[PDB]
Design an enzyme around this catalytic site. Structure first.
Site, PDB file in Angstrom:
ATOM      1  CB  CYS A 228       5.651   7.965   6.454  1.00 28.22           C
ATOM      2  SG  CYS A 228       6.842   6.753   7.115  1.00 28.22           S
ATOM      3  CE1 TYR A 272       8.048   7.698   7.827  1.00 27.97           C
ATOM      4  CE2 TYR A 272      10.272   7.789   8.865  1.00 27.97           C
ATOM      5  CZ  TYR A 272       8.932   7.057   8.450  1.00 27.97           C
ATOM      6  OH  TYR A 272       9.187   5.611   8.052  1.00 27.97           O
ATOM      7  CD1 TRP A 290      11.240   7.541   5.817  1.00 26.60           C
ATOM      8  CD2 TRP A 290       9.395   8.063   4.769  1.00 26.60           C
ATOM      9  NE1 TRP A 290      10.869   6.474   5.373  1.00 26.60           N
ATOM     10  CE2 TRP A 290       9.801   6.519   4.857  1.00 26.60           C
ATOM     11  CE3 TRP A 290       8.153   8.305   3.831  1.00 26.60           C
ATOM     12  CZ2 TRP A 290       8.835   5.387   4.092  1.00 26.60           C
ATOM     13  CZ3 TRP A 290       7.507   7.263   3.285  1.00 26.60           C
ATOM     14  CH2 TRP A 290       7.954   5.833   3.500  1.00 26.60           C
ATOM     15  CE1 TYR A 495      10.486   3.876  12.943  1.00 24.11           C
ATOM     16  CE2 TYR A 495      10.009   2.322  11.248  1.00 24.11           C
ATOM     17  CZ  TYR A 495      10.335   3.498  11.561  1.00 24.11           C
ATOM     18  OH  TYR A 495      10.520   4.343  10.423  1.00 24.11           O
ATOM     19  CG  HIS A 496       6.209   1.424  11.919  1.00 29.52           C
ATOM     20  ND1 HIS A 496       6.621   0.878  10.717  1.00 29.52           N
ATOM     21  CD2 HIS A 496       6.586   3.007  11.563  1.00 29.52           C
ATOM     22  CE1 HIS A 496       7.117   1.747   9.963  1.00 29.52           C
ATOM     23  NE2 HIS A 496       7.153   2.811  10.251  1.00 29.52           N
ATOM     24  CG  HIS A 581       6.676   7.389  12.273  1.00 31.35           C
ATOM     25  ND1 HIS A 581       5.336   6.974  11.683  1.00 31.35           N
ATOM     26  CD2 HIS A 581       7.818   6.727  11.649  1.00 31.35           C
ATOM     27  CE1 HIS A 581       5.651   6.210  10.432  1.00 31.35           C
ATOM     28  NE2 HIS A 581       6.901   6.011  10.691  1.00 31.35           N
TER      29      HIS A 581
HETATM   30 CU   LIG Z   1       8.617   4.722   9.774  1.00 33.63          CU
END
Ligand SMILES: [Cu+2]
Ligand SMILES: [Ca+2]
Length: 639
Positions: A228, A272, A290, A495-496, A581
């Site tokens: 992240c 993030y 985050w 996601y990711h 991300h």
């Molecule tokens: Cu994440």
């Protein structure tokens, strides 16, 4: 664990063969449905033949194969785990072509998977090239092969997916190592999990496009779990990776030495956040709630020369906050940042409000108007993408995303933003009629010809879940202001997930998941080969060659002279990419104005403004009249 993309083929009538098998550990013990029985190659009194070892399946009839699975021994014996491997398919059992998948599996007893584009086949072969810890043997408790519900041939002219690269981690962050051409990837303190990290550890993996070799490495020297993070390639040619699971740490990846070096701690703990390289080679970052706490995290700036982070408290994050329902934890995440003229940074979204950030003194921020068009004011677009496909004309394409980070419907919204000087409000218009498919958590790269490749995502953002997936990628072509669907893939990349442009002009797309004991971890990537690499018959086209360059390192404003083996019509510089991300603040494209010296000798100037030609590593691509790009020549741009 993980999962296949199809459904298990019944094995009742299979015929199998192995390169060797110990008595009692016969080849067919791998398909008997008993987790406690296994195939095992020769050992003991039979001697210990070293890998490669091979498992071949005759399924008797054609199936639409899209994957296989390997269940390791369940009795605690660790000596037969398959490391490096290849998967082949055949219709006759003799001609196997190129692998549909290859790579390296992690060294443990978890079930391993190879997932790949559906291809009709009767025969399947698994090659264990190495044992995971270098031992002589190969063993399998259960092997399965998976089928798609149907098969559709790729349409001509719309690119091609494959092969799959099998990995020992989930690559949720990635970058190109420009000096080596390798893809660098990392996960967290574990290969597929970030949860409950003690910090101080990152698992990394790399893939070499030239050899197919997947490697891995555990990085502890920077005392940083880099899940992240912010990512930027700075002017000194080092990748600056900030915060995340260890929210104050900075790590530096040096391509030249292929090593990680400790950086200074950030002033503010972040996760993030986006960071962006600046016109002077420094790195700006802002936001990121985050990790490190949830509160207003204003800007700060990293100087590679003095090795310091300095707070810019008056570069206020407040103007760029989205209206996310979860509040600050999300609303300051993943800014669409672009380094620009005179130390400025443009923030294009995801908030409706766009802003200019300034890095002199203690920082500043100025409104740049709302992202909008004649269709209306654009809503917040968290985890939409933003791509600078023509830096010389200040062009940014933005698309997709959703008003909230999660549990929110993605959109087809897309815009062209045209940057002028810092402190002016850029013109914004709608891009064509928007995306074919609404998506969030998608990824994108600018291609040599200025088109933008857009892939993956899902229609409703639900992290760690592979629901409402979008399997059809799209390409935006600026000169036609039109989007085009390309051939679909079969692995969910939501996601990711990540995408990067490779120096050879193909796209590397991978990851998804990273949620520990979830079923949605994707320990792999796929290559997309764009249509510009194929001739009219679907064969790989002949590519122009750059046969000489006058220099490989140039200051902004400087000229380069090149020689080619054939006439070229266009050329572009594309800055090497970094991704996590949905964020990639490092890529951008400069279309080059060529002077023809005659005799297939050409020259061009690198733009004199380093806010446009951001310092760092760039790819030089030349294209022939047919639109086929060369492989990239690596150029260092200095300010
Ligand atoms: Cu994440
Ligand atoms: Ca068995």
């Amino acid at each position: 664990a993980s999962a296949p993309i199809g459904s298990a083929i019944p094995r009742n009538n299979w015929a199998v063969t192995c390169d060797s098998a110990q008595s009692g550990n016969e080849c067919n013990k791998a398909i008997d449905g008993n987790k406690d029985t296994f195939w095992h190659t020769f050992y003991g009194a039979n001697g210990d033949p070293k890998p490669p070892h091979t498992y071949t399946i005759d399924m008797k009839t054609t199936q639409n194969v899209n994957g296989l699975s390997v269940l390791p021994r369940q009795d605690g014996n660790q000596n037969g785990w398959i490391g490096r491997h290849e998967v082949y398919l055949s219709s006759d059992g003799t001609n196997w072509g190129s692998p549909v998948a290859s790579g390296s599996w992690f060294a443990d007893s978890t079930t391993k998977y190879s997932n790949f584009e559906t291809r009709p086949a009767r025969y399947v072969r698994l090659v264990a090239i190495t044992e995971a810890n270098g031992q002589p043997w190969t063993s399998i408790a259960e092997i399965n092969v998976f089928q798609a519900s149907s098969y559709t041939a790729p349409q001509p002219g719309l690119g091609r997916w494959g092969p799959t690269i099998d990995l020992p981690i989930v690559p949720a962050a990635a970058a190109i190592e420009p000096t080596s051409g390798r893809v660098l990837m990392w996960s967290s303190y574990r290969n597929d999990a970030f949860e409950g990290s003690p910090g101080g550890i990152t698992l990394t993996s790399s893939w070499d496009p030239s050899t197919g070799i997947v490697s891995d490495r555990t990085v502890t020297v920077t005392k940083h779990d880099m899940f992240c993070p912010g990512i930027s390639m700075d002017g000194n040619g080092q990748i600056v990776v900030t915060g995340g699971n260890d929210a104050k740490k900075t790590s530096l990846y040096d391509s030249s030495s292929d090593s990680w070096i400790p950086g200074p701690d950030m002033q503010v703990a972040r996760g993030y956040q986006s960071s962006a390289t600046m016109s002077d080679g420094r790195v700006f970052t802002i936001g990121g709630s985050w990790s490190g706490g949830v509160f207003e995290k204003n800007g700060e700036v990293y100087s590679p020369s003095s090795k310091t982070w300095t707070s810019l408290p008056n570069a206020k994050v407040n103007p760029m906050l989205t209206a996310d329902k979860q509040g600050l934890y999300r609303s300051d995440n993943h800014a669409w940042l672009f380094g620009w003229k005179k130390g400025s940074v443009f923030q294009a979204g995801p908030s409706t409000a766009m802003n200019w950030y300034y890095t002199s003194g203690s920082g500043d921020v100025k409104s740049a108007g709302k992202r909008q068009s004649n269709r209306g004011v654009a809503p917040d677009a968290m985890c939409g993408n933003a791509v600078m496909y023509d830096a010389v004309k200040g062009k940014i394409l933005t698309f997709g995303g959703s008003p909230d980070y999660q549990d929110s419907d993605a959109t087809t919204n897309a815009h062209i933003i045209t940057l002028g000087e810092p402190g002016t409000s850029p013109n914004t218009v709608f891009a064509s009629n928007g995306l074919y498919f609404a998506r969030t958590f998608h990824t994108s790269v600018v291609l040599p010809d200025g088109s933008t490749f857009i892939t993956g995502g899902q229609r409703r953002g639900i992290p760690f879940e592979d629901s409402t997936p979008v399997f059809t990628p799209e390409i935006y072509v600026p000169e036609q202001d039109t989007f085009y669907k390309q051939n679909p893939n079969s692995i969910v990349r939501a996601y990711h997930s990540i995408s990067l442009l490779l120096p050879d002009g193909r796209v590397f797309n991978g990851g998804g998941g990273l949620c520990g004991d979830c079923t949605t971890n994707h320990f792999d990537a796929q290559i997309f080969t764009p249509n510009y690499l194929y001739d009219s018959n679907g064969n790989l086209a002949t590519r122009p060659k750059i046969t000489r360059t006058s220099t490989q390192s140039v200051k902004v404003g400087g000229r380069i002279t090149i020689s080619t083996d054939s006439s070229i019509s266009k050329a572009s510089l594309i800055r090497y990419g970094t991704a996590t991300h949905t964020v990639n603040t490092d890529q951008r494209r400069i279309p080059l104005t060529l002077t023809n010296n005659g005799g297939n000798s050409y020259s061009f100037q690198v733009p004199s403004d380093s806010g446009v030609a951001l310092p760092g590593y760039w790819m030089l691509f030349v294209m022939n009249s047919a639109g086929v790009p060369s492989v990239a020549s690596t150029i260092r741009v200095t300010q």
